[PDB]
Design a protein around this ligand. Sequence first.
Ligand code: HEM
Length: 399
Amino acid sequence: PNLPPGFDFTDPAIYAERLPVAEFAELRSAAPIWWNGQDPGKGGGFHDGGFWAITKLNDVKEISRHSDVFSSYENGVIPRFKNDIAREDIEVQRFVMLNMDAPHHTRLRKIISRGFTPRAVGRLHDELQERAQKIAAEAAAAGSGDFVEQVSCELPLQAIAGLLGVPQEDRGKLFHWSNEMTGNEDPEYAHIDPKASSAELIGYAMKMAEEKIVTQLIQADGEKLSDDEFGFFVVMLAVAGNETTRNSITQGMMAFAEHPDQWELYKKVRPETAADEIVRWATPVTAFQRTALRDYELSGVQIKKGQRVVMFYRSANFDEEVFQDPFTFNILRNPNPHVGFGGTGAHYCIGANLARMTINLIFNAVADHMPDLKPISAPERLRSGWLNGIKHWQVDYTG
Ligand code: HEM
């Protein structure tokens, strides 16, 4: 493929500035499964010499479905940390369900699925809609500001707090820990320590279990989460369901500002198709990886036992063989078989309906209170090699 020597699709220096859209398009055309070599000390915490870049939607789905072959536990699923991270700090992530394999993952998922019943999520609709409306009214009344802080940030956090029934007076400390919990190497956040925030949030959650959906997870059906598993579950919601939904809201609004005919259509009919096109477009998790437990032949390439494969959701969601005109933002897109919530399989996002509900509620509120919003200056991207984040974006709410 026509790529620079040494190019690495997980390099945080690229994502601080842009998504490498042209370079993914070139792999899909010229080398859809391609070995991305990494030199010593430049592998983002891994020392194995590189990984297979997976760029096509069917391959991402095949890997996700074959979790008997493609492990989440062996190396975790995050494909890039700071280059000098200790291997013990990657391995400690194995205590969240995202980084486990069957049978351990199968037991936790079954218990945690108590939290994500359709009924549990739907119960949160009326409070999240009242919060959404108020957030948008507050932003309109401020006139201009940072849309990430004023519109995107609070409602995903209040969704987790309402799911967990956290008392009001404890939400400010909960939200502070949760916004320090996912790792990045951005200079704006160089003074955060996700390790203290993780310890502190696990201790808060364990005290909450001891005092008792929390009661349904920690009450024996004799199966239940232990008190420490409930802590690890609250840590996992902080990393899985906070910045991801926040970034789907910012990048959905960036797409509406760049495609004004789609925002006019959305304001009229608020279509059911919009939330999934916002997630496809935003692809807030750019990639997650697996490790092969045995040799496996994937679309003609011989993947070998122990090698990593990195699923680039950001490429697969723009796969020209699967989406008609994938570079067109189309809020009526149908069909829409995107992998923004992962490939279907054992670890498919358990929060997907809660995220869709959060997205729908906030965009309805923005349409109702700020229909003529316009950007003031360019979004500031986050320096991460796997999370596609926007730190700040200045907009004029009144237009
Ligand atoms: C637009 C917002 C979101 C995006 C893009 C997203 C994306 C993902 C992805 C890509 C995965 C891994 C799937 C796989 O490997 O096949 C995942 C898993 C997971 N997500 Fe989400 N997510 C979002 C929102 C949420 C929310 C709101 C919650 C919860 C409050 C949540 C909870 C989880 C959990 C617990 C897992 C682990 C499932 C397991 O390992 O069995 N997510 N998510």
